[PDB]
Amino acid sequence: SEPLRIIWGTNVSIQECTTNFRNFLMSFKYKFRKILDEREEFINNTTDEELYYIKQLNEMRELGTSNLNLDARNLLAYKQTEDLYHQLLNYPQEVISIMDQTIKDCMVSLIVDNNLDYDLDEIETKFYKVRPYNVGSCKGMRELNPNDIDKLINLKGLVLRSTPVIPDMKVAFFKCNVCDHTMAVEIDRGVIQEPARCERIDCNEPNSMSLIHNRCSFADKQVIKLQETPDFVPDGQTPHSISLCVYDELVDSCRAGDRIEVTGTFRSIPIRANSRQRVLKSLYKTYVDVVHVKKVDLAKIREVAAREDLYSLLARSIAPSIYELEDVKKGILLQLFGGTNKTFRYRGDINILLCGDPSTSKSQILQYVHKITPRGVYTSGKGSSAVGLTAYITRVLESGALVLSDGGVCCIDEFDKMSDSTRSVLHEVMEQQTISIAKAGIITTLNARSSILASANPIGSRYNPNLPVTENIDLPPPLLS
Amino acid sequence: ASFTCDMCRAIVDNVEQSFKYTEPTFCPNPSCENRAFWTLNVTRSRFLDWQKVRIQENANEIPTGSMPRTLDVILRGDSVERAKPGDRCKFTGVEIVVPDV
Amino acid sequence: ALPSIQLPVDYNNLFNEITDFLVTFKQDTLSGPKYMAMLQKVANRELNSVIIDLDDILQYQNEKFLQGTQADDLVSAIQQNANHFTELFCRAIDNNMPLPTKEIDYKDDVLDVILNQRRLRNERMLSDRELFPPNLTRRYFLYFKPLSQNAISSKPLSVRQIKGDFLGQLITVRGIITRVSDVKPAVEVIAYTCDQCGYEVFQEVNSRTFTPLSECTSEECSQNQTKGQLFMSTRASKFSAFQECKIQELSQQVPVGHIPRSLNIHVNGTLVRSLSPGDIVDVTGIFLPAPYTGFKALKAGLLTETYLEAQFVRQHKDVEERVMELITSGDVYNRLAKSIAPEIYGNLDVKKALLLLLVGGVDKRKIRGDINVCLMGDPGVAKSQLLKAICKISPRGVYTTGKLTAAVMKDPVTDEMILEGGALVLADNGICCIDEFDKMDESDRTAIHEVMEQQTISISKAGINTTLNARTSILAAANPLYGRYNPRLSPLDNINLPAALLSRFDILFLMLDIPSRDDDEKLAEHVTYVHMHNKQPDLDFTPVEPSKMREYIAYAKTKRPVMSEAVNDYVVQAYIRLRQDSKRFSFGQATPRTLLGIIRLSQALAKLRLADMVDIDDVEEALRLVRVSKESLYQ
DNA sequence: TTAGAGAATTGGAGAGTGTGTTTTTTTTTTTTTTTTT
DNA sequence: CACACACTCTCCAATTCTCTAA
Ligand SMILES: [Zn+2]
Ligand SMILES: [Zn+2]
Ligand SMILES: [Zn+2]
């Protein structure tokens, strides 16, 4: 009688999928997860008795936010829904599309059946989404193979780079050249289902209907190139990498060089042999289509700020392994806070040099400061070219250790054996907090604004105490001053 | 744009241009079977001034010192040459999609 | 145009011989039929590839010749044209494969549903008051394994011996795998759904490229003259894992004045990721032309490019008791040291130091446990061979000359970027053997410092703002300016390493090519023997095998010995005197790095004797390596 | 007034004609200028 | 070269228009 809806190729009923997931998405107490893993001694009334996804959805409504995260193991925790976890892993694109809509049905039921006073169109207009995560065991990018096409997979990696955002068309917009009538045409599997004729029966002209690009509607696509994590590599060779497409609200989740864990459907597509024909290469380009990404009080101030010993406490706790050197600790501490700043000159940046034999822990202090400091960079005197420490122009800003650390400690070691062309970088930074450049049409100034912590050795043998500090570092007084 | 038909010597005018160059699909003379073979009249057709300027995210704004993201901005009419390289500018106008023509 | 010819082959005979072989054959001479039992594992889904041993088909033909019935020379067919027989053996298998006996959980698979709905639609249509390509349903990959010597598939070829006359034949090729693709899906059968008629159609692909169908041709679509639209479905397509590899001939094989040539190997199906770059390997495979397709096929002319389909792979190259079999011989420290590089005679304290790299100190929280050792002095002392011996002996070892850092590398080989991990990242949780340590760029030299100070390396290019964890023990060696070390002078005078780097090693060791009549006779008698007798001279002791040495060390490391009170009490009583004498001629003063060094060294000796903690009978030796190093700096 | 036979126009099958396609691009030498050697 | 796509040409029959007798 009812024309049953079935996921293609599966013998899975979409009504049973929906009417199970609804009855998980409410009535799931978090108690059930603490039965699944046990730890069942730990059960706490306040969290564990609450209807977990009810509280999540009431938050979504009031924040006006459209995305529900879902740890897939909850589906196994609840008796009715164990087989849905297996459907979610095996048939992601359809099972996620059922979950997306069930959220939207629930959001409406939670106000209209509950007869609560709120704006309905504010919910009806939203594209709600599930973002499933914790889906299964992670696997090596190198362990992927064609058995996995169209399944949820869980990967860990390092982001190499992102493309700038790509507009992906979601609704084409067409206009009749003869009659000015217009249509929203639905994009389907990336093909525009173009009309043959004007939709107005009073016009009905063939071929006169035409596309208007800036009246179409678009989604946001971004390619991330993701490298294999160095823990996973077979040690005989290089890491691999995989491209992944991140979509809609997940665009710019990641900076370059983030470690991330991703959940996505593993995809393959044919690619054209030649851009003028439909002839396709017999081995397919592969990527992951991601659905989730994961990375990698005042009274406590008063506990410290009232204290008698305070300055000595802070000094003895910024670097607690380091033996004595108490006045070095005491001054470095003031460099962390800094002085004061004004606009309408001088600024609250502070600069410190360490000098003495290479045989002592002073470099380890330079390490602790890099560990404690907001922002900041660690480098050394021989450690780059001058333009590699300041800035340069390329095939477009190259930026170095002396920049991108406003109010942050620029740690530098080996400062005595920095090359003099590279010493001659610092006067504009240390005296005016700023840099100037002009090349290839660019005329520009850059704000450097770093508190420098420098470290230096004696040239050659042990530092003699009779002879002066200017000589014994071989370093120019107007930079030392 | 404005065009003359080489087949019948008629004239077509006010021909709006999308991102691509666009000749008329049909001759305006009902004696003429033409759908192609058009020549531009350079006296009667009208040209805007135009300039592309390439801009990037400001070197103080980039959140972690990552790579600077760029944008292509199109200037027209009086607004051309109103900026210079290395300068800092505020532009207002539409965001557009440009087809790969 | 298309003439025809009388070849001495009949595939109807040979198909009958193959099916007669598969059902009949048992290797009962090893004292049911071998391939039937194998196919049961395939039907139960416990197995995904069928290996056909050509050496079996000899025993089949031998038994049939002994029964006086002349089997039709089948090995000489399938060596001579292997490609076509992959089709015949798949037909012969499918005709004979037994019904499953274990439950599959059938409805978890897509094709079980699709083909059943296709079955039922044909019955409900054909009531009316192949079915589809068989490659779609082959859940297994077929491979031939060649003849062992007991014939052309037996004799391994260098890459230049593979003439054009070999195309189509089963051959065996010997070489290094020089590079390897990431694994990608190739299609074999493409499934399409018609939108309007709701009917599935399959295209089979047998070329580098193909053209998609787009327009429906199902009976019920064309009979209803409905211009149905076909859409590709990857869920019902059949793919195979494809990986392309390149093989190069070995340096022994290249004739004098030529260049090492290469072949492309295509590995398909379960045999994938069996090859790794730098393997020396024999690959047996079916040699083939890769025909150009489309416009390139016209202009390329008759000049076919070529590749080898992999079929089988031969690599060229008790634990828990063997560590006791060492321990119960006794004196393990001195014998393990004497067993580092047994071909180098003398220099004992260096070997007795290097052993403590392999074993190392202990990390704490961070504080470094890794140990840094720098060998120093004259050329011709064979420091490079000793660093090389440590690279082979050590677990996770890496040799790397100055002749190193991680960096972004843009379009290496394929036109894509990579963040390349340098030798200091290859050496993660192991030994970095940096030979010619002073022949180094300042950009690498100052990146040694951050591996010391931070156990990491840092990147700052192309937006890659990353730090990579890089804990590693450094073994270093350097060579003097002016060709020989000057005993009038310091290491700091003979070598360009500054004290701010050179003083970061737990051991610096000056070893010299000192001339002396007896010592020179002892060396020259060893060298002049190795020119008469191609194997090493008599050691006059028995060394530990490197595998048993590795097996000891991996177990010795994890014991991470802890302090005993007399150690901390005693070590200060030495360290203070070492400071007091450093007060009283080079740079060799008692820095706190040397206290930490004595701790890590005493930990490495404690590990070697296998205990939770150890008495200062231990610590007194750690002080002796340091004391002997300083006396070696002076002489 | 319904309904059925004969005349005219339009749709699209399908036959025919014409065009473009491989494709790369680092490497190695030679030079001339800045500056960091 | 040859094999797909782009585009025009031509014929044939399918549908609707128009007139006549039942
Ligand atoms: Zn219209
Ligand atoms: Zn005209
Ligand atoms: Zn159809």
Phi-psi region at A451: left, alpha or beta (left = phi > 0; alpha = psi -120 to 50)? beta
Closest nucleotide to C225: CA versus each C1':
D13
Axis-axis angle for helices A362-372, A326-337 (nearest 10) = 30
Among chain B residues, the shortest Cα distance to A443 is held by: B86
User: In angstroms, how far is E19 C1' from A202 CA?
Assistant: 30
Chain A residues whose beta carbon lies within 8 Å of the beta carbon of residue B96:
214
Residues A187, A285: one domain? yes
Q: C179 pairs with which residues across the strands?
A: C246
The residue assigned the tokens 């058009």 is B38
Q: Is the CB of A278 under 7 A from strand E?
A: yes
Taking CA atoms, C379 is separated from A336, C141, C479, C480, C513, in Å, by: 50, 57, 6, 8, 8
Residues tagged in the binding site annotation of A: 356-363
3-state helix, strand, coil in chain C (%, to 5): 40, 20, 40
Using the beta-carbon criterion (under 8 Å), do A403 and B65 form an inter-chain contact? Answer: yes
Rounded Cα distance, C101 and A169, in Å? 51
Phi-psi region at A224: left, alpha or beta (left = phi > 0; alpha = psi -120 to 50)? beta
Measured in angstroms, the CA of A442 and the nearest CA of chain B are apart by 4
Name the nearest CA neighbour of A7 among C400, C460, C114, B91.
C114
Among chain C residues, the shortest Cα distance to A283 is held by: C186
CA of B26 to the centre of ligand 2 (A): 8
Q: Is the CB of C295 under 7 A from strand E?
A: yes
Query: Residue C314 gets which letter from DSSP?
Result: E
Experimental method: cryo-EM
Rounded Cα distance, C163 and C155, in Å? 14
Output phi, psi for C374, to 5 deg: -115, 115
Q: Chains A, C: CB contacts under 8 A, how many?
A: 163
Q: Which residue of A160, A380, A462 is in closest CB contact with C419? A: A160
Q: Strand E: which bases are under 7 Å from protein Cβ?
A: 1-2, 4-5, 8
Considering every ligand atom shown, identify the ligand nearest to the alpha carbon of residue A174 and give its number: 1
Please check whether residue C590 is in contact with residue C574, taking contact to mean a CB–CB distance below 8 angstroms: no
CB atoms within 10 A of CB A351: 15
**Residue C374: enclosing H or E segment and its boundaries?**
strand C373-376
Rounded Cα distance, B81 and A386, in Å? 35
Interface contact C464, partner B, CB < 8 A: no
Chain C residues whose beta carbon lies within 8 Å of the beta carbon of residue A461:
587
Please check whether residue A403 is in contact with residue A388, taking contact to mean a CB–CB distance below 8 angstroms: no
Q: Which residue of A167, A442, A446 is in closest CB contact with B85? A: A442
Name the nearest CA neighbour of C594 among C582, C586, C612, C605.
C582
Phi-psi region at A263: left, alpha or beta (left = phi > 0; alpha = psi -120 to 50)? beta
Q: What angle do CA C396, C402, C405 make, to 5 degrees?
A: 60
CA of C42 to the centre of ligand 2 (A): 73
Residues A197, A100: one domain? no
CA of B21 to the centre of ligand 2 (A): 20
**Furthest-apart CA pair in chain A: how many Å?**
105
Output phi, psi for A87, to 5 deg: -65, -40
User: Mutate which of A280, A325, A412 to disrupt the C interface (most C C-beta within 10 Å)?
Assistant: A280
Residues A81, A204: one domain? no
The SS3 assignment for C434 reads strand
Interface contact A164, partner B, CB < 8 A: yes
Contacts of C89 (CB under 8 A, 6+ apart): C18, C50, C52, C142
Using the beta-carbon criterion (under 8 Å), do B86 and A444 form an inter-chain contact? Answer: yes
Q: A427 pairs with which residues across the strands?
A: none
Question: How many residues in total does chain A contain?
Answer: 481
Question: What torsion, rounded to 10 degrees, do the Cα atoms C63, C65, C69, C73 define?
Answer: 100
Taking CA atoms, B26 is separated from A197, A453, C26, in Å, by: 18, 76, 80
CA of A232 to the centre of ligand 2 (A): 71
Considering every ligand atom shown, identify the ligand nearest to the alpha carbon of residue A198 and give its number: 1
Residues A229, A202: one domain? yes
- Exposed / middle / buried, residue C392 (Cβ in 10 Å: 0-12, 13-18, 19+): exposed
Interface contact A176, partner B, CB < 8 A: no
Q: Are strands C209-210 and C200-204 parallel, antiparallel or unpaired?
A: unpaired
- Exposed / middle / buried, residue A299 (Cβ in 10 Å: 0-12, 13-18, 19+): exposed
Chain B neighbors (3+ CB pairs < 8 Å): A, C
- Exposed / middle / buried, residue A191 (Cβ in 10 Å: 0-12, 13-18, 19+): exposed
Name the nearest CA neighbour of C370 among C430, C422, C426.
C430
Rounded Cα distance, C507 and C497, in Å? 15
Please check whether residue A232 is in contact with residue A141, taking contact to mean a CB–CB distance below 8 angstroms: yes
Taking CA atoms, B7 is separated from A20, B32, B42, in Å, by: 70, 7, 19
Rounded Cα distance, C99 and C376, in Å? 72
Distance of CA A209 to the CA centre of its chain: 43
Interface contact A401, partner B, CB < 8 A: no
Interface contact A365, partner B, CB < 8 A: no
Measured in angstroms, the CA of C266 and the nearest CA of chain A are apart by 13
CB atoms within 10 A of CB C523: 14
Sheet holding C398-401, edge to edge: C398-401, C431-435, C473-477, C373-376, C507-510
Rounded Cα distance, A320 and A367, in Å? 12
Residues tagged in the binding site annotation of A for ATP: 356-363
| Selected residues 427-466 of chain A with any CB under 8 Å from a CB in chain B | 438, 441-444, 446-447
Contacts of A299 (CB under 8 A, 6+ apart): none
Residues A286, A208: one domain? yes
Q: A451 pairs with which residues across the strands?
A: A409
Please check whether residue B41 is in contact with residue B5, taking contact to mean a CB–CB distance below 8 angstroms: no
Rounded Cα distance, A432 and A455, in Å? 22
User: Mutate which of B67, B69, B70 to disrupt the C interface (most C C-beta within 10 Å)?
Assistant: B67
Residues A284, A149: one domain? yes
> Could you confirm whether domain C318-629 is CATH 3.40.50.300?
yes
Output phi, psi for A374, to 5 deg: -55, 150
Spell out where C118-215 has E strands: 141-145, 170-180, 184-194, 200-204, 209-210
Using the beta-carbon criterion (under 8 Å), do C462 and B67 form an inter-chain contact? Answer: yes
Copy the structure tokens of residue B98.
């440009």
Q: A244 pairs with which residues across the strands?
A: A224, A288
CA of C130 to the centre of ligand 3 (A): 19
The SS3 assignment for C46 reads coil
The residue assigned the tokens 């730090």 is C467
Q: Are strands C141-145 and C170-180 parallel, antiparallel or unpaired?
A: unpaired
Rounded Cα distance, A411 and C490, in Å? 32
**Furthest-apart CA pair in chain C: how many Å?**
115
Rounded Cα distance, C493 and C377, in Å? 12
Chain C residues whose beta carbon lies within 8 Å of the beta carbon of residue A324:
none
CA of A205 to the centre of ligand 2 (A): 22
Q: What's the domain range around A275?
A: 138-296
Using the beta-carbon criterion (under 8 Å), do B96 and A214 form an inter-chain contact? Answer: yes
Residues tagged in the binding site annotation of C for ATP: 345, 380, 382-384, 479, 504, 593
